[PDB]
Amino acid sequence: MSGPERITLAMTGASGAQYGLRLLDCLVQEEREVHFLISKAAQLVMATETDVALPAKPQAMQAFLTEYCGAAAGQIRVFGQNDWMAPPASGSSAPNAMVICPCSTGTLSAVATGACNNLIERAADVALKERRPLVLVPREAPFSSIHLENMLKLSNLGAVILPAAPGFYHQPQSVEDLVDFVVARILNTLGIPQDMLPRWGEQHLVS
Amino acid sequence: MSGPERITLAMTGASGAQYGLRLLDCLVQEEREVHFLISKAAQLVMATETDVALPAKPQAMQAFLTEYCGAAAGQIRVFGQNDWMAPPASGSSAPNAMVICPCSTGTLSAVATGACNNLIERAADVALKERRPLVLVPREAPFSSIHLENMLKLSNLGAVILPAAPGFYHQPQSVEDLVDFVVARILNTLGIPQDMLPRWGEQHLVS
Amino acid sequence: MSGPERITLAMTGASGAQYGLRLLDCLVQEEREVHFLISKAAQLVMATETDVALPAKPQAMQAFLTEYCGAAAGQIRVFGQNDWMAPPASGSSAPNAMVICPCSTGTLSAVATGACNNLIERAADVALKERRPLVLVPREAPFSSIHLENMLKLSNLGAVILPAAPGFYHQPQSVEDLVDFVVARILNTLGIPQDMLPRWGEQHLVS
Amino acid sequence: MSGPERITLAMTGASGAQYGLRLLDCLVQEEREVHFLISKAAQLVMATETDVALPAKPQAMQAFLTEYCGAAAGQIRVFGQNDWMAPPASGSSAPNAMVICPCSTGTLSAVATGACNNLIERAADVALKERRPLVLVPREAPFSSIHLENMLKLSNLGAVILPAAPGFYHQPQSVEDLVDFVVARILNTLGIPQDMLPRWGEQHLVS
Amino acid sequence: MSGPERITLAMTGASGAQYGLRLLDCLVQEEREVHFLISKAAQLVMATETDVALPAKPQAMQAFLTEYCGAAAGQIRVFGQNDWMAPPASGSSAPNAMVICPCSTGTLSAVATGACNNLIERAADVALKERRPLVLVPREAPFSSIHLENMLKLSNLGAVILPAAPGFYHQPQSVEDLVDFVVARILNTLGIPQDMLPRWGEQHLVS
Amino acid sequence: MSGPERITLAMTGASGAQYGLRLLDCLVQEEREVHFLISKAAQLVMATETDVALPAKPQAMQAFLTEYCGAAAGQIRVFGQNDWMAPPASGSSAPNAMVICPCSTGTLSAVATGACNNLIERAADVALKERRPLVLVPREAPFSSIHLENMLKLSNLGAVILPAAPGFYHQPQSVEDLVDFVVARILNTLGIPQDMLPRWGEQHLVS
Amino acid sequence: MSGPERITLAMTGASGAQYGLRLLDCLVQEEREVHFLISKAAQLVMATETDVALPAKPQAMQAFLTEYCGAAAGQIRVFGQNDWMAPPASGSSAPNAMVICPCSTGTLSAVATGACNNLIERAADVALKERRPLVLVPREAPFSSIHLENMLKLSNLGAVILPAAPGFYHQPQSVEDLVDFVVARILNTLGIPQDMLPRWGEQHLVS
Amino acid sequence: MSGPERITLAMTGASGAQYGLRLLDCLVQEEREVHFLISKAAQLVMATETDVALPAKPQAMQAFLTEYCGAAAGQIRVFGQNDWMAPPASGSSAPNAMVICPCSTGTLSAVATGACNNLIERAADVALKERRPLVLVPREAPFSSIHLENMLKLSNLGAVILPAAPGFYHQPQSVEDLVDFVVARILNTLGIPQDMLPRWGEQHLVS
Numbered sequence A, B, C, D, E, F, G, H: 001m002s003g004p005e006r007i008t009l010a011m012t013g014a015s016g017a018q019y020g021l022r023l024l025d026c027l028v029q030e031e032r033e034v035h036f037l038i039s040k041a042a043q044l045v046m047a048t049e050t051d052v053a054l055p056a057k058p059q060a061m062q063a064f065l066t067e068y069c070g071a072a073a074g075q076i077r078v079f080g081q082n083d084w085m086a087p088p089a090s091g092s093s094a095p096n097a098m099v100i101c102p103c104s105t106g107t108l109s110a111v112a113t114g115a116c117n118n119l120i121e122r123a124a125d126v127a128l129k130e131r132r133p134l135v136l137v138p139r140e141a142p143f144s145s146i147h148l149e150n151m152l153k154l155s156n157l158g159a160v161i162l163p164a165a166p167g168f169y170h171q172p173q174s175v176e177d178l179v180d181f182v183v184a185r186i187l188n189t190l191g192i193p194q195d196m197l198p199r200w201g202e203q204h205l206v207s
């Protein structure tokens, strides 16, 4: 397989719950192991803007998502926001790529300043210190200078700042096709196969 | 009327031609005068990703768009990329708000460094020096540190960096509803009435 | 009316509860709509240093303050610290000016770094990104370099840093007159009429 | 004795003459020697906002203040604004702590940039170069970014930026009690005994 | 006595609970008064990596530690994480030196940015603003650039960054001897007598 | 094999000779080729704080260490401090990972500023310019701001700053177990198998 | 006694050997213990510009200087440039103030960047990390921007930059009186009694 | 002639009046035209530390100095501190080199920030803007970070920062020989012949 075997997927409280669910689905279909993390604000967002009835506590959540995605047993592990015994909490853990999608402006700030106030924030802190991949998917508009300075600092340290800014150049016919654009971008960044977004110009030889 | 009477609307070569067309339509419906500017790369984008057959040269383009939008005569003025005699070229012009939507990473850079290589770039330069409103709508992903540093510098000087990052919290049913989200945000930033995106929490009194 | 119709007034855990109460009273007397926010530490401060018995929960608090100020029904809206459905949480809300008075060093930091950990902090973050007025009233002494760097960054972005530093040049006779000095300054900054602090030198024509 | 035997107390032209007079009184009561310096603008402030009739020239001023405070002969030395032969002008002088209270934004600037235009400004310059204590008590509101950058630079070099921002948590009953709060803070910073502001939590053992 | 009479000792959630316990023991043996603070994550660390059964709540914790160390009554005061009435919360408190040992990357960040979210973080903020001693003992590896920038900013402001990096040059025979090395370093920094680590080269006169 | 086939291991004059010896032993056991470099101060440290009688000159040193570690012939190459003909001196050499363990504050400085005064310093300079892995293991306490600024600059350029700060969370029973903690961290950073430090939380599925 | 009991006095290769000799003499007369360090370039300077025939090696040098100054036995300790076992090499040593007089531009640079290439440079590095006094006495003219940036960085960290720039305001009659001016300044900075330079304005009471 | 025909020589209020007088004498002996400027504080310094009885007003001062130096008529022009009609006030003047000797910390600051408060300060401002030579001769000790940052900024812009720091390597026998060292350095910097300080190593061919 190309790309990482294990991905820490954190969802935080920005608009765009559909991006996180769709990415979790694609990762499951590519037979990757997923350590799933979700913030209390992200649970509110998912309730407000989708019809997914996600259980509150980690054990019921893991059952639910395993079903929702057609996953194998043990494929999705769910960890709570203060579970410091979970792999993402420590750099001595086995190597994982991490994606925060969506990434709230609050979580962006926490990762930029090193706040480490919960498992999501600490797991990003660990990714940076161990130089493991870290992809942040913000959804906000306008971006203030506070937002931008946080993104610049993280990008300069090697995090990939991938905003939820879909392109329109693959004939999108629905909301799902825009969601897939961004998910494909994330998958390309991780080095994981995807077939939702073609390789640009791959058949063009000259002109 | 609340908001500016005249808006310079520049389209540049990022994905998202639909955002620029829809904004031009809303501005026409709110009876504003629009100075329309379009880059050569943006004409290619519009050809690639829409079915709008926009004429190449300014006089035919102005006729075309006046028709496309149901505009009054003289309501849309179109200026070419080297027309230094057009109002946006000089700070001695009458006051306009300016929006670059979509805003390519190339145009972002040119405005940040002050390159002024064509009328779009000079008009932004003039907006900044006269402290008139300037809203930039980038569409790119990932954003590199070069992109981010250009956005931060412009935001620190008072430009509004409004990425084409639609939210999902008003029950979007189509691509058009995501386009409208971003257009509504732009209109709110200019202070121009819109009824596509409700005012958040306006009916919530307590809890 | 001159000045904003709606003001988000946040109280946070610095000394100076009287400044926040007096400002809320003046805003009510000028017929403005107030979105009132209060932190858990600020509730402790108000208990420690005043005799106002403010109810704990938002609905009882709103009744209490409506009475305390002689307000009209609906004039004061109170929102809890995690009520992400309230208007100040989103930039899609209708435009409000925001004042944080008093502003703790913790809240100053959170706004400077973009932490957005509760509604007060997120509402400031939204004010900055939408370029709506934001006035911060710190009360601390000494100010360390951490405090000062947070204030400088926010002032450079356009926040008004208005410390609770009353002047003595209008013959103050009581603690209430010093409180009124600072409140008048805040009201002048918002553009809202006040008659507690005269206009300096308004009758002086020459010398 | 704890704290310095000699204090250079400079008064400059910000509101808050009462803070400077009260501090001079407390220092005299603690049997310290005071080198008293006062700017021409501060003399105007004292005339405008108090009823103290301070003589203009140094010899008469020294007599006046010696009386006003109940000081011993020689306890208060007064030096004029161009008296380069006075101890505070040179780093070869005996060690003194310096307090500028109130500290105008002009004097803040002069000390930050090293202007040394009069004895007050040079004495601060000497304090910094000899690493002797320097406490600045500004009274201004709002603080601009110019003010804040001057304060940050001085704080980073080890000056104590102590704004005239009294707290309300010791049951203040009058203007005099707010003045005493700030004076007590200054005295605590110098390490000089005071009994106006109790030691916080000194009797609290647990909870 | 040389060194401070009162030390605020805060334990936070990094590996190295033994360093904090041993320092508390040495401070008790040198007859100092200790204000003991402990974070919720540090309680988890102590449970995971030692056999000390520390009670959860402050009153039982104070009894426990008084016993564990052979302390006098009142010698160890324990304060909870939201006890804003305890001495370390305010700069008006009596002077204490503060040591955070171990110091988590989260607590490092909070002190660097001024977050003040709990008593530990506020007490450090107060130490810096009052220019009282502040010693931070991080335990992490690798240190990222976020960690390092937080440490540099605090060191530039006068905090002592003392990582839990024991030396091997005093013939260490056990884990306890490495723990004692770091504790001795902390005690030397505070100016408090210790006899675990000899004075280097004290008997060497020439060569 | 996972990880690099060749490692340049440099020892410099900080406390912690045991870390460098143990790492050299683990690298030999994993069948890697090691280019061993040692400074004159590090030879003094090893004499002072261990019982290893390391020969002075490179040929005798190579024989000695080959024996000490059970290495194959040619597995350990030793190069002197001015041997500019050795592979690590030039970027045209075959690719190696480099570890400086322990890393003195002097060697840290030299690498940060680019001094290149001996083979160790030049080999690090070459690692950075060719973007090959570079891991620095400092042992010092306190770290001054000079130390920290040197570490930050190198970390920002992609060096891994891994201080000799062992954790206590794998039940350490001896000095050797603390040494192994840090060595395991270094091996994890290089991507080389180790079984001294388990993978955190690897068996934890939920909670 | 006021001031430190032990002073590390380092001489380095700038013009002004007489300043270093005279300071060593005054320190001996004030009964302080001196750890004397001298660079190879400073030995050349002393040969070139004085008639002091200083022995080359430390044991003979210590005898020589003990005689030259009228010191007690053991009062002057001399350490060679690579004697890492001497007290100044380690922060675990007993506390000393350090003066580098004269301070070459090379030694200034080494201390600023943390090079630690010999005992003088390491002893300064240790002074900074332990926050012990460090006074640098450069003699160079012009100062380039490289010199100035090195001095600024060290001054910002708390080193005292005291150039060999004598004043003329105490009626100097000879070269010795100019040398004494600078030596007195150094002694004042250390807090050690001296009677060569009077206290400025000490008898001036008013004007 | 080598070097400039006209030199603006400004004296300001630092110790070292003898340097300025001696330079004026050497410039007269080399037949240069001198525009002489002197501050009010420098007149006080000259009264305090020399026996030169310099007349107060410019016309009498010019007569006096013409005599003191053996100058030709018109060779020394003296201009008062507010004489904006004198050549140094404007960049349209004929080209002159400027030397401020001695240069007070106040004048250093004024030139660094561009204050231009009197003819000396404006003449330096003009030198910098026209890129004419500007040499500043400070006399202060210690130099604070404020001093150093002012010197660094001016040196980075091309001013020569030449402190009054004489060397001892040309067998100085008196105060006059130290004064001549610095004057020779200034003359070398201007490119004007001098024979007080030999050319170093001019007769050394090898070793």
Ligand SMILES: Cc1cc2c3c(c1C)C(C)(C)CC=[N+]3c1c([nH]c(=O)[nH]c1=O)N2C[C@H](O)[C@H](O)[C@H](O)COP(=O)(O)O
Residues within 6 Å of the ligand: A011, A012, A013, A014, A015, A016, A039, A040, A041, A042, A044, A045, A048, A049, A103, A104, A105, A106, A107, A139, A140, B167, B169, C084, C090, C115, C116, C117, C118, C122
């Ligand atoms: C609950 C809530 C919070 C929104 C939010 C919404 C809700 C329902 C929406 C969907 C109705 C409107 C859009 N919101 C966004 C948002 N923050 C942000 O960066 N982008 C957003 O798009 N916020 C704020 C965000 O959740 C917070 O500031 C939380 O403190 C973040 O905490 P977290 O990082 O731990 O998830």
Ligand SMILES: Cc1cc2c3c(c1C)C(C)(C)CC=[N+]3c1c([nH]c(=O)[nH]c1=O)N2C[C@H](O)[C@H](O)[C@H](O)COP(=O)(O)O
Residues within 6 Å of the ligand: A167, A169, B011, B012, B013, B014, B015, B016, B039, B040, B041, B042, B044, B045, B048, B049, B103, B104, B105, B106, B107, B139, B140
């Ligand atoms: C023509 C072309 C150019 C794209 C582009 C596309 C096409 C059709 C798409 C739609 C197929 C794929 C997306 N593209 C984007 C893009 N630049 C950018 O910032 N965001 C984009 O989304 N570029 C590049 C951009 O047009 C250039 O770098 C031009 O030089 C910009 O010139 P302009 O600012 O004057 O318009």
Ligand SMILES: Cc1cc2c3c(c1C)C(C)(C)CC=[N+]3c1c([nH]c(=O)[nH]c1=O)N2C[C@H](O)[C@H](O)[C@H](O)COP(=O)(O)O
Residues within 6 Å of the ligand: C011, C012, C013, C014, C015, C016, C039, C040, C041, C042, C044, C045, C048, C049, C103, C104, C105, C106, C107, C139, C140, D167, D169, E084, E090, E115, E116, E117, E118, E122
């Ligand atoms: C409860 C409490 C907290 C004080 C405080 C007091 C109390 C009663 C006083 C009145 C007795 C003494 C003064 N205090 C101030 C203070 N922080 C600050 O910036 N200025 C203050 O004047 N603090 C600290 C502050 O409340 C905190 O650090 C909280 O974490 C801030 O949380 P908040 O921003 O959410 O309100």
Ligand SMILES: Cc1cc2c3c(c1C)C(C)(C)CC=[N+]3c1c([nH]c(=O)[nH]c1=O)N2C[C@H](O)[C@H](O)[C@H](O)COP(=O)(O)O
Residues within 6 Å of the ligand: C167, C169, D011, D012, D013, D014, D015, D016, D039, D040, D041, D042, D044, D045, D048, D049, D103, D104, D105, D106, D107, D139, D140
């Ligand atoms: C005379 C005068 C000047 C005030 C002033 C007042 C008066 C009476 C008051 C009391 C009526 C209103 C408040 N004022 C303040 C003030 N500057 C400042 O930083 N804070 C102030 O509170 N200023 C300005 C200040 O005095 C100047 O800018 C002087 O140039 C400062 O010179 P100084 O530093 O040498 O004293």
Ligand SMILES: Cc1cc2c3c(c1C)C(C)(C)CC=[N+]3c1c([nH]c(=O)[nH]c1=O)N2C[C@H](O)[C@H](O)[C@H](O)COP(=O)(O)O
Residues within 6 Å of the ligand: A084, A090, A115, A116, A117, A118, A122, E011, E012, E013, E014, E015, E016, E039, E040, E041, E042, E044, E045, E048, E049, E103, E104, E105, E106, E107, E139, E140, F167, F169
């Ligand atoms: C509970 C827990 C948290 C560890 C931790 C461990 C556990 C048991 C160990 C011992 C098993 C592994 C090492 N850990 C460290 C750590 N943070 C850190 O900076 N260094 C550490 O050595 N963390 C994270 C840290 O506790 C957090 O990010 C908390 O949010 C910090 O909160 P605090 O500052 O309020 O204590």
Ligand SMILES: Cc1cc2c3c(c1C)C(C)(C)CC=[N+]3c1c([nH]c(=O)[nH]c1=O)N2C[C@H](O)[C@H](O)[C@H](O)COP(=O)(O)O
Residues within 6 Å of the ligand: E167, E169, F011, F012, F013, F014, F015, F016, F039, F040, F041, F042, F044, F045, F048, F049, F103, F104, F105, F106, F107, F139, F140, G084, G090, G115, G116, G117, G118, G122
């Ligand atoms: C010889 C010697 C030098 C120690 C030292 C010791 C000795 C025996 C010890 C073990 C007794 C005490 C601790 N020391 C350390 C140290 N430098 C440092 O960064 N950390 C240290 O732990 N130093 C200083 C260091 O060796 C120097 O400054 C050398 O110039 C570094 O040269 P190098 O980088 O080429 O090895």
Ligand SMILES: Cc1cc2c3c(c1C)C(C)(C)CC=[N+]3c1c([nH]c(=O)[nH]c1=O)N2C[C@H](O)[C@H](O)[C@H](O)COP(=O)(O)O
Residues within 6 Å of the ligand: G011, G012, G013, G014, G015, G016, G039, G040, G041, G042, G044, G045, G048, G049, G103, G104, G105, G106, G107, G139, G140, H167, H169
């Ligand atoms: C030997 C030598 C070196 C002089 C020197 C002289 C000699 C005799 C003089 C006395 C004839 C002329 C003046 N010199 C000075 C000088 N460096 C400097 O900063 N200021 C000086 O005044 N240098 C250079 C300085 O010694 C070096 O650059 C050494 O490398 C410094 O090494 P050190 O810091 O270890 O002493």
Ligand SMILES: Cc1cc2c3c(c1C)C(C)(C)CC=[N+]3c1c([nH]c(=O)[nH]c1=O)N2C[C@H](O)[C@H](O)[C@H](O)COP(=O)(O)O
Residues within 6 Å of the ligand: D084, D090, D115, D116, D117, D118, D122, G167, G169, H011, H012, H013, H014, H015, H016, H039, H040, H041, H042, H044, H045, H048, H049, H103, H104, H105, H106, H107, H139, H140
């Ligand atoms: C009058 C006076 C002022 C001294 C001074 C002296 C006197 C007699 C001495 C000779 C007795 C002691 C040394 N002093 C120096 C000094 N400033 C400085 O940078 N270096 C000095 O060496 N000062 C201060 C300096 O003159 C001022 O701060 C003036 O405001 C500077 O104004 P100027 O730049 O316009 O000359």
